[PDB]
Write an enzyme that holds these catalytic residues in place. Structure first.
Site, mmCIF file in Angstrom:
data_model
loop_
_atom_site.group_PDB
_atom_site.id
_atom_site.type_symbol
_atom_site.label_atom_id
_atom_site.label_comp_id
_atom_site.label_asym_id
_atom_site.label_seq_id
_atom_site.Cartn_x
_atom_site.Cartn_y
_atom_site.Cartn_z
ATOM 1 C CG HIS A 78 1.545 -3.272 1.297
ATOM 2 N ND1 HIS A 78 1.422 -4.088 0.193
ATOM 3 C CD2 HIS A 78 2.872 -3.129 1.509
ATOM 4 C CE1 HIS A 78 2.622 -4.434 -0.235
ATOM 5 N NE2 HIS A 78 3.521 -3.860 0.543
ATOM 6 C CG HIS A 82 4.153 -3.984 5.834
ATOM 7 N ND1 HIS A 82 5.286 -4.763 5.841
ATOM 8 C CD2 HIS A 82 4.384 -2.996 4.944
ATOM 9 C CE1 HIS A 82 6.160 -4.277 4.987
ATOM 10 N NE2 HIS A 82 5.635 -3.208 4.422
ATOM 11 C CG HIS A 118 7.855 1.814 4.444
ATOM 12 N ND1 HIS A 118 7.809 1.205 5.680
ATOM 13 C CD2 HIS A 118 7.458 0.881 3.551
ATOM 14 C CE1 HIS A 118 7.406 -0.046 5.534
ATOM 15 N NE2 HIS A 118 7.184 -0.266 4.253
ATOM 16 C CG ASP A 119 4.413 0.483 2.288
ATOM 17 O OD1 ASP A 119 4.817 0.939 1.182
ATOM 18 O OD2 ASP A 119 4.681 -0.669 2.661
ATOM 19 C CG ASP A 221 9.346 -2.607 2.805
ATOM 20 O OD1 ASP A 221 8.334 -2.999 3.417
ATOM 21 O OD2 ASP A 221 9.270 -1.937 1.748
ATOM 22 C CD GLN A 255 6.368 -16.124 -0.959
ATOM 23 O OE1 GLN A 255 6.162 -15.401 -1.933
ATOM 24 N NE2 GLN A 255 6.607 -15.640 0.259
HETATM 25 C C1 LIG Z 1 2.827 -15.520 -1.455
HETATM 26 C C2 LIG Z 1 2.160 -14.447 -2.320
HETATM 27 C C3 LIG Z 1 3.062 -14.028 -3.488
HETATM 28 O O1 LIG Z 1 4.328 -13.551 -2.939
HETATM 29 C C4 LIG Z 1 5.142 -12.962 -3.861
HETATM 30 C C5 LIG Z 1 5.073 -13.318 -5.207
HETATM 31 C C6 LIG Z 1 5.884 -12.692 -6.148
HETATM 32 C C7 LIG Z 1 6.807 -11.744 -5.728
HETATM 33 S S1 LIG Z 1 7.888 -10.930 -6.845
HETATM 34 O O2 LIG Z 1 9.164 -10.613 -6.118
HETATM 35 O O3 LIG Z 1 8.211 -11.914 -7.939
HETATM 36 N N1 LIG Z 1 7.259 -9.514 -7.477
HETATM 37 C C8 LIG Z 1 7.404 -8.433 -6.481
HETATM 38 C C9 LIG Z 1 6.849 -7.120 -7.049
HETATM 39 N N2 LIG Z 1 5.434 -7.258 -7.390
HETATM 40 C C10 LIG Z 1 4.710 -7.537 -6.131
HETATM 41 C C11 LIG Z 1 5.296 -8.329 -8.407
HETATM 42 C C12 LIG Z 1 5.829 -9.652 -7.843
HETATM 43 C C13 LIG Z 1 6.814 -11.345 -4.410
HETATM 44 C C14 LIG Z 1 6.086 -12.024 -3.457
HETATM 45 C C15 LIG Z 1 6.213 -11.563 -2.154
HETATM 46 N N3 LIG Z 1 6.442 -10.267 -1.935
HETATM 47 C C16 LIG Z 1 6.543 -9.764 -0.694
HETATM 48 C C17 LIG Z 1 6.872 -8.275 -0.601
HETATM 49 C C18 LIG Z 1 5.550 -7.504 -0.485
HETATM 50 C C19 LIG Z 1 6.328 -10.582 0.419
HETATM 51 F F1 LIG Z 1 6.428 -10.066 1.675
HETATM 52 C C20 LIG Z 1 6.025 -11.926 0.220
HETATM 53 O O4 LIG Z 1 5.835 -12.719 1.150
HETATM 54 N N4 LIG Z 1 5.880 -12.369 -1.083
HETATM 55 MG MG LIG Z 2 5.801 -1.623 -0.458
HETATM 56 ZN ZN LIG Z 3 6.529 -1.877 2.631
#
Ligand SMILES: CCCOc1ccc(S(=O)(=O)N2CCN(C)CC2)cc1-c1nc(CC)c(F)c(=O)[nH]1
Ligand SMILES: [Mg+2]
Ligand SMILES: [Zn+2]
Ligand SMILES: [Mg+2]
Ligand SMILES: [Mg+2]
Length: 298
Positions: A78, A82, A118-119, A221, A255
């Site tokens: 972040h 990004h 936005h971040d 995003d 993922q």
């Molecule tokens: C590979 C490292 C882990 O990757 C993730 C694991 C879990 C989840 S989640 O949807 O279940 N949930 C989302 C809200 N918080 C973060 C708790 C967890 C999201 C990701 C993920 N998010 C983004 C958006 C920031 C990516 F761009 C990305 O590539 N991967």
């Molecule tokens: Mg964010």
């Molecule tokens: Zn963002």
């Protein structure tokens, strides 16, 4: 003035084609900070924002150096890169995605600034900012940060708007930035999906418009998920570093979960609105194949 301001101010701004910022599969790993700065200027320019709102070059540049300065480099995912990618994806969805022609100049201006802002000043998902009691806490803060910058001397890229326009734009910016709360997105997407399946979707409605803009924000995003595999792998690796370090066996699983829960439906929906954003849905599907296969080797 800073050394950096003089350099970016004095630079030449390559074409959009030369900068490649029109391809949904765009990537920034080989770019220097300066080159992102130029890419950003190119975005405002090709969207007609500098024209229609009389932005002084030095002001725009200063605004961008400011935005960039107020992301933290010490945060793995972040950060400026990004934010820069979010805006580039906005751009591509506007031009290549043929969404520009469904929106007003003011919406666009607002979406671009929102995308970049936005971040702002984000500290990584594993860090706490306390105040009274808690409500999109973070996104309220990103917006404050945004407004502060917009209102700084030398940085006021909105000076050229009437108050009426200005007020309108700010409201949109604020809502855009707040739409980047995934919680807000989950609350509001149901309605968006209904409208679609019931052939009811209509952008000419104020309420549905505002909702699409929220959806569009989330789509850009999360667009890293739509990237070519070699790039998606590398971003996933940045995200992992922020999530866990600030096994890698559980990751392909997460993922797939993330794609299923959040991303696929959104990019499907977005593709119904505009058939030319299909490349995002496509990218996201390919990546699901890739991650699933890996999760099975586990
Ligand atoms: C590979 C490292 C882990 O990757 C993730 C694991 C879990 C989840 S989640 O949807 O279940 N949930 C989302 C809200 N918080 C973060 C708790 C967890 C999201 C990701 C993920 N998010 C983004 C958006 C920031 C990516 F761009 C990305 O590539 N991967
Ligand atoms: Mg964010
Ligand atoms: Zn963002
Ligand atoms: Mg550099
Ligand atoms: Mg001033």
């Amino acid at each position: 003035e800073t050394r950096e301001l003089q350099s970016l101010a004095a630079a030449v701004v390559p074409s959009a084609q030369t900068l490649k910022i029109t391809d949904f599969s765009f990537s920034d790993f080989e770019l220097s900070d300066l080159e992102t700065a130029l890419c950003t200027i190119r975005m405002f320019t090709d969207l007609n924002l500098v024209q229609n709102f009389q932005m002084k070059h030095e002001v725009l540049c200063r605004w961008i150096l400011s935005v960039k300065k107020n992301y933290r480099k010490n945060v793995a995912y972040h950060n400026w890169r990004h934010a820069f990618n979010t805006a580039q994806c906005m751009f591509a969805a506007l031009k290549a995605g043929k969404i520009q022609n469904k929106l007003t100049d003011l919406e666009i201006l607002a979406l671009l600034i929102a995308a970049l802002s936005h971040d702002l000043d984000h500290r990584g998902v594993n860090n706490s900012y306390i105040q009274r009691s808690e409500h999109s806490i973070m996104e309220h803060h990103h917006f404050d940060q945004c407004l502060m910058i917009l209102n700084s001397p030398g940085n006021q890229i909105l000076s050229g708007l009437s108050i009426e326009e200005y007020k309108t734009t700010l409201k949109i910016i604020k809502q855009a930035i707040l739409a980047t709360d995934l919680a807000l997105y989950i609350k509001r997407r149901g309605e968006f999906f209904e409208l679609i399946r019931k052939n009811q979707f209509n952008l000419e409605d104020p309420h549905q418009k505002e909702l699409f803009l929220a959806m569009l924000m989330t789509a850009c995003d999360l667009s890293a998920i739509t990237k070519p595999w070699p790039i998606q792998q590398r971003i996933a690796e940045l995200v992992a570093t922020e999530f866990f370090d600030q096994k890698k066996n559980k990751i392909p699983s997460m993922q797939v979960g993330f794609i299923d829960a959040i991303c696929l439906q959104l990019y499907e929906a977005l593709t119904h609105v505009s058939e030319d954003c299909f490349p995002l849905l496509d990218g996201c599907r390919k990546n699901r194949q890739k991650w699933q296969a890996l999760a099975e080797q586990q």
